[PDB]
Amino acid sequence: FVNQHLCGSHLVEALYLV
Amino acid sequence: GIVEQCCTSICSLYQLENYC
Amino acid sequence: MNNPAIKRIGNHITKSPEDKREYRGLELANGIKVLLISDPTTDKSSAALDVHIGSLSDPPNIAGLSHFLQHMLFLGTKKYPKENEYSQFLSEHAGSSNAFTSGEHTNYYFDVSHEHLEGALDRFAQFFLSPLFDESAKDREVNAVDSEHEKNVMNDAWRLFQLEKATGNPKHPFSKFGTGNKYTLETRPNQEGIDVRQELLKFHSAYYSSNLMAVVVLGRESLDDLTNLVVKLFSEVENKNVPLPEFPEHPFQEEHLKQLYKIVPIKDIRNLYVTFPIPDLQKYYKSNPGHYLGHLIGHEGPGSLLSELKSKGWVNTLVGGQKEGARGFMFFIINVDLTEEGLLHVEDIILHMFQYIQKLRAEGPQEWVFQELKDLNAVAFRFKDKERPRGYTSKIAGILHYYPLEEVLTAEYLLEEFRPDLIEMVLDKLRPENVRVAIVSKSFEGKTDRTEEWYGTQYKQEAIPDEVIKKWQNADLNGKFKLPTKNEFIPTNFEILPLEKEATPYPALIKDTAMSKLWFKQDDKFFLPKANLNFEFFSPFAYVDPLHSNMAYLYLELLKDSLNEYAYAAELAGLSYDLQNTIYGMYLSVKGYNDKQPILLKKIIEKMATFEIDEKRFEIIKEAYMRSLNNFRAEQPHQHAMYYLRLLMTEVAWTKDELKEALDDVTLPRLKAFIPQLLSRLHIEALLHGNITKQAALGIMQMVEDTLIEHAHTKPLLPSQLVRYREVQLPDRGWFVYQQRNEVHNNSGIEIYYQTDMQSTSENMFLELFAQIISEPAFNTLRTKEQLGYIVFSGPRRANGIQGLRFIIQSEKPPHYLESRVEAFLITMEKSIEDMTEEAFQKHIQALAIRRLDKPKKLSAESAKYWGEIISQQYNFDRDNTEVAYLKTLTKEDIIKFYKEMLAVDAPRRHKVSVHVLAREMDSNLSQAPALPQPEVIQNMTEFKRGLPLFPLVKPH
């Protein structure tokens, strides 16, 4: 399990997946 | 918007799930 | 008196006076920082351990080693050598566990039933004492890591993440590739004579030193008992005195400043990333100059940067603020999405950013702004929601490395120092001469000349022309930019209303009229000055056809877009809202401090009902929506599989394709006409829950109603028009396959659904017990042993009052192969249920029992439970006691025949549908897989549905 920086419409995009 | 928790810092899967 | 094992016990750990949990900080003799948390109410206990090492310390020749190590710690230790002893123990005792690896941390956490802390914790401690790194575990698990990366390869954020690293100093640890894959972790090391088991052993032994560890443990036990527990299991972790890695040199040096990157995305997105290297501000946490600037540059109120960029029609959204690097370096960012016009005005957008920054220089640092941030953080801390233990321990374990024991609870909230010198110091770094600009757009397709190694990302690099720098260095004051003004939404009434004589433990229906059903509960648990107000608005016109569905959506996007300037203050002030179109109409949730909440709500509904669409805004948002519909093609194969099953199994569902098509007929006239029609007839079902009275709830409800009547002439909908959708009823013994291709990703995904029957007490607990029993085994078989992929999921599927068992997997292997492996698994499970002891069977009952009875730790978790009961229209508020009483009645037998009746390959009532999503490229040892029948291949979704019965809907409680 790795993660990244989740900024703006990227956090939105990630929340879908998760 | 101010950089989010998950933006400013690297979140666990757990922290991400907190929003669902 | 003195304990040899403990270097010191800290003083009182500062906490909210609302926090009834108790706390003890210590440092062990070997250097481990510890927080202990005693909560005699908690249902699950929890621990976490954070090692201050991560991928930035990977060997340069084995990218991903510390991530790989993080996977390997779960697969056996000297003291508990069974590969999955850990995860099975957790499973059987209502727990779960995960871990992550960032550049400087590896963070491991679990929870468990409160009665089995010591057992869980002992198993966990072994991770840090003597992992086996089994040779055969290693060859298998490297596939999990490879698959973890495969999934990310075509994600836009991951590619940008690694691209930034690829374009700074390549000698800097920052440019490492943290994830790893099969190549970096197995192939290339084999080629180079590396024994990876030894490298794992070496890295663990070198870096997993007690001095670099922080542990947190949360349990019912006294603080003394917790103390002895932690001493006992962690004193033996060995201290090797590892110096903490530090990166004082910024990976962006001069050759890396004033650079422009033109990047080709996977999705059709248009974004601009502006970044400045800064020093590490972490040590300034008592002032937080970077948050002050983020608040100001990221503001969305009147006067703000965004607000002008948006008026100019160039950007829709903006985030700004400080972003972490590692110890020694950080970044300050400002990122915006781009309209088409925006894409051609990048240069001016950035001038505006610099003008706004110049304005901050001109007005100088503002104590009043600092006070707001400080007050708001003080209030947020005082009234923080009680966290779920697993997140809480994990979080605190990370931050124990950064703050004195006594401040770990408050360090991130309580501001203390006003620092106009730091604010100016950071402001002096936000200058055109140290700027990096990255533009992401499909327009660069074919115009690029570099390729990032790990992800394949296509891009171009260019010096920003000196003349462009200069133009930016001379940014003048722009009269469109003002500092914000006092935030009037800042709450100040925090009184908790006394619990009413007629208060109830579950929501009560306190109003049942043609227009509205009001469920209400005054909070009798949490006692924070907050509330949740949820509303379903029903209208058939939100989803009658694709066109209407597009309009419902665009309407609400326009409305939020139009409230945004005003709503942003409320959101800073802990008052937020969520508004969206659903297949039934609309959903509105307003949450936060209940002090100013009626003002926001009243503003929303009033704007809803008198809405005027700005035309430029309409065109921009319409174009954005089109792209987001297209961008569905780039989602993951397993998301695709889930999506198609949803379409197949629900009575009415419009496809992304149908929505796309219908989108061109959405005109301004057409939308203006839709809104009054949508609002002309409604039914409202609401849950009002929190620090509110019955009278205030009836008041709020009627206010919403009256506003709608006044401005939109709403009338009630007829009881019969309250359509709920049904689920396709599958025939005894059928198997249907629906097959599709993911065009972007080179993995496949499958979802397999064994539909059982309608939800009811007995049917639910049959399915849930079974899912509980097969749950870690499926993970352990389909992933840990067979390594079919990283994503392997199994569990209950519930929709439209119906249910069944589902499997979701994403793999490199073709779906038809995946099927056969799941089927082979299913047989392993029946045999396993026969073979298990009575007592193993009762542990599973007890573990499901604990999972279902776990009490909500905050308001909105309790609201969500009630809301699920309402939107599903089962209204079973006491379901957990009922279903658990019934669960305890069940025997091996029951589950064996349930399985034999509904699930076995030759079951008389098997009802199976499978969605196969093929990998981009596909053209169309092991337990024994049963022979399967010929599936019926679904050719057309509409036909499939037409040709089957539909289930009833579930009766209300």
A4: chain C residues, CB-CB within 8 Å: 157-158, 161
Bridge-based pairing of strands C458-463 and C575-582 is unpaired
Bridge partners (DSSP) of residue A6 are none
At which residue do the structure tokens 């963070």 appear?
C107
Write down the number of H helices and E strands in chain A: 1, 0
Contact at CB, B15 and C395, closer than 8 angstroms = yes
Contact between C882 and C761 under an 8 Å Cβ cutoff? The reply is: yes
Tell me, rounded to whole angstroms, the distance of Cα A2 from its chain centroid.
12
Q: Which residue, among C663, C579, C585, C674, has the nearest Cα to C624 in the 3D structure? A: C663
Which of B7, B8, B14 is nearest residue C390 as measured by Cβ atoms?
B14
What is the total residue count of chain B?
A: 20
B8 part of contact set with chain C, CB < 8 Å: yes
Distances (CA, A) of C77 to C122, C128, C142, C211: 11, 9, 18, 21
Contact at CB, B20 and A11, closer than 8 angstroms = no
Query: How wide is the angle at C-alpha C674 spanned by C-alphas C672 and C675, nearest 5°?
Result: 75
Among 3.30.830.10, 3.40.1280.10, 3.40.50.1220, 3.40.50.2000, name the CATH number for the domain at C245-474: 3.30.830.10
Q: Please, which chains are in contact with A (at least 3 CB pairs closer than 8 A)? A: B, C
Chain C residue with minimal CA distance to A6? C157
At which residue do the structure tokens 């009823």 appear?
C729
The 3 state secondary structure assigned to C350-412 is HHHHHHHHHHHHHHCCCHHHHHHHHHHHHHHHHCCCCCCHHHHHHHHHHHCCCCCHHHCCCCC
Contact at CB, A5 and B7, closer than 8 angstroms = yes
Q: What are phi and psi of C228, to 5 degrees?
A: -65, -35
At which residue do the structure tokens 């990157």 appear?
C261
Distances (CA, A) of C904 to C677, C818, C898: 50, 17, 9
Distance (Å, rounded) from C-alpha C293 to C-alpha C668?
39
At which residue do the structure tokens 């401005």 appear?
C711
Could you write out the DSSP letters of every residue in C864-917? HHHHHHHHTT---TTHHHHHHHHHTT--HHHHHHHHHHHTSTT-TT-EEEEEEE
Environment class of C327 (CB within 10 Å of its CB; exposed 0-12, middle 13-18, buried 19+): buried
Contact at CB, C320 and B3, closer than 8 angstroms = yes
B20 part of contact set with chain C, CB < 8 Å: no
Distance (Å, rounded) from C-alpha C131 to C-alpha C214?
19
Tell me, rounded to whole angstroms, the distance of Cα C890 from its chain centroid.
35
Q: Which residue, among C69, C45, C43, has the nearest Cα to C55 in the 3D structure? A: C69
Contact between C735 and C752 under an 8 Å Cβ cutoff? The reply is: no
The 3 state secondary structure assigned to C215-265 is EEEEECCCHHHHHHHHHHHHCCCCCCCCCCCCCCCCCCCHHHCCEEEEECC
Tell me, rounded to whole angstroms, the distance of Cα C459 from its chain centroid.
29
For testing contact with chain C, the best of B4, B8, B18, B20 (most C CBs within 10 A): B8
Fold of C728-957: Cytochrome Bc1 Complex; Chain A, domain 1 (3.30.830)
Distance (Å, rounded) from C-alpha C615 to C-alpha C622?
10
State whether residue C720 is helix, strand or coil: helix
At which residue do the structure tokens 């229209």 appear?
C873
A11 part of contact set with chain B, CB < 8 Å: yes
Rg of chain B over all Cα atoms, to the nearest angstrom: 8
The interaxial angle of helices C196-207 and C65-72, nearest 10 deg, is 90
Distance (Å, rounded) from C-alpha C818 to C-alpha C823?
9
- Rounded to a whole number, what is the largest CA-CA distance in chain A? 22
Contact between C214 and C34 under an 8 Å Cβ cutoff? The reply is: yes
The 3 state secondary structure assigned to C482-532 is CCCCCCCCCCCCCCCCCCCCCCCCCCEEEEECCCEEEEEEECCCCCCCEEE
Chain C residue with minimal CA distance to A7? C319
Contact between C123 and C81 under an 8 Å Cβ cutoff? The reply is: no
Distance (Å, rounded) from C-alpha C401 to C-alpha C802?
48
Chain B residue with minimal CA distance to A13? B16
Contacts of C237 (CB under 8 A, 6+ apart): C30, C32, C125, C128, C129, C210, C213
B18 part of contact set with chain C, CB < 8 Å: yes
Residue C679 host element (H or E): helix C668-679
Contact between C701 and C511 under an 8 Å Cβ cutoff? The reply is: yes
A15 part of contact set with chain C, CB < 8 Å: no
Distance from CA of C882 to the nearest CA of A (A): 31
Distance (Å, rounded) from C-alpha C84 to C-alpha C90?
10
Bridge-based pairing of strands C516-522 and C22-28 is unpaired
The 3 state secondary structure assigned to C442-490 is HHHCCCCCEECCCCCCEEEEEECCHHHHHHHHCCCCCCCCCCCCCCCCC
Distances (CA, A) of C46 to C9, C36, C118, C216, C581: 21, 10, 10, 8, 38
Contacts of C177 (CB under 8 A, 6+ apart): C63, C64, C162, C165, C184, C454
CATH number of C501-727: 3.30.830.10
Environment class of C603 (CB within 10 Å of its CB; exposed 0-12, middle 13-18, buried 19+): middle
| C245-474 and C501-727 in the same fold | yes
Distance (Å, rounded) from C-alpha C580 to C-alpha C535?
11
Q: Which two tokens stand for residue C658?
A: 């149908």
Bridge-based pairing of strands C936-937 and C575-582 is unpaired
C148: chain A residues, CB-CB within 8 Å: 1-2
C109: chain B residues, CB-CB within 8 Å: 12, 14
Contact at CB, B12 and A7, closer than 8 angstroms = no
C790 part of contact set with chain B, CB < 8 Å: no
Contact at CB, C157 and A8, closer than 8 angstroms = no
Q: Where are the alpha helices (DSSP H) in C573-612?
A: 597-608
Distance (Å, rounded) from C-alpha C949 to C-alpha C169?
63
CA count, 13 A, side-chain hemisphere, C863: 23
Distance from CA of C362 to the nearest CA of A (A): 28
- The pairs formed by C411-416 with CB atoms below 8 angstroms and a separation of 24 or more are C411/C285, C412/C285, C413/C377, C413/C378, C413/C380, C413/C381, C413/C384, C414/C374, C414/C377, C414/C378, C414/C381, C415/C286, C415/C287, C415/C288, C415/C370, C415/C373, C415/C374, C415/C377, C416/C286, C416/C287, C416/C374
Tell me, rounded to whole angstroms, the distance of Cα C166 from its chain centroid.
27
A7 part of contact set with chain C, CB < 8 Å: yes
CA dihedral C782, C786, C789, C791 (to 10 degrees): 20
Distance (Å, rounded) from C-alpha C350 to C-alpha C356?
10
State whether residue C208 is helix, strand or coil: coil
For testing contact with chain A, the best of C71, C151, C268, C319 (most A CBs within 10 A): C319
C102: chain A residues, CB-CB within 8 Å: 2-3
Contact between C16 and C397 under an 8 Å Cβ cutoff? The reply is: no
Fold of C1-244: Cytochrome Bc1 Complex; Chain A, domain 1 (3.30.830)
Distance (Å, rounded) from C-alpha C615 to C-alpha C485?
29
Which of B7, B13, B20 is nearest residue A1 as measured by Cβ atoms?
B13
Environment class of C632 (CB within 10 Å of its CB; exposed 0-12, middle 13-18, buried 19+): middle
Chain A residue with minimal CA distance to C269? A9
Contact at CB, B3 and A7, closer than 8 angstroms = yes
C102: chain B residues, CB-CB within 8 Å: 10
Which of A5, A8, A14 is nearest residue B16 as measured by Cβ atoms?
A14
Query: How wide is the angle at C-alpha C382 spanned by C-alphas C378 and C385, nearest 5°?
Result: 120
Q: Where are the domains of chain C?
A: 1-244, 245-474, 501-727, 728-957
At which residue do the structure tokens 């309009």 appear?
C551
Listed resolution, Å? 2.6
Contacts of C695 (CB under 8 A, 6+ apart): none
Rg of chain A over all Cα atoms, to the nearest angstrom: 8
Q: Which two tokens stand for residue C772?
A: 């509980």
Q: How far apart are the first and last CA of chain C?
A: 61
A5: chain B residues, CB-CB within 8 Å: 6-10
Q: Which residue, among C261, C170, C194, has the nearest Cα to C453 in the 3D structure? A: C170
Chain A residue with minimal CA distance to C177? A2
Contact at CB, A2 and C178, closer than 8 angstroms = yes
Contact at CB, A2 and C100, closer than 8 angstroms = yes
Tell me, rounded to whole angstroms, the distance of Cα C651 from its chain centroid.
29
Distance (Å, rounded) from C-alpha C388 to C-alpha C393?
9
Chain B residue with minimal CA distance to C321? B3
Tell me, rounded to whole angstroms, the distance of Cα C467 from its chain centroid.
43
A14 part of contact set with chain B, CB < 8 Å: yes
CA count, 13 A, side-chain hemisphere, C43: 17
What single-letter amino acid sits at C838? E
Contacts of C657 (CB under 8 A, 6+ apart): none
A5: chain C residues, CB-CB within 8 Å: 161, 323-324
Contacts of C279 (CB under 8 A, 6+ apart): C329, C330, C429
Contact between C339 and B9 under an 8 Å Cβ cutoff? The reply is: no
Contact at CB, A18 and B6, closer than 8 angstroms = no
Contacts of C446 (CB under 8 A, 6+ apart): none
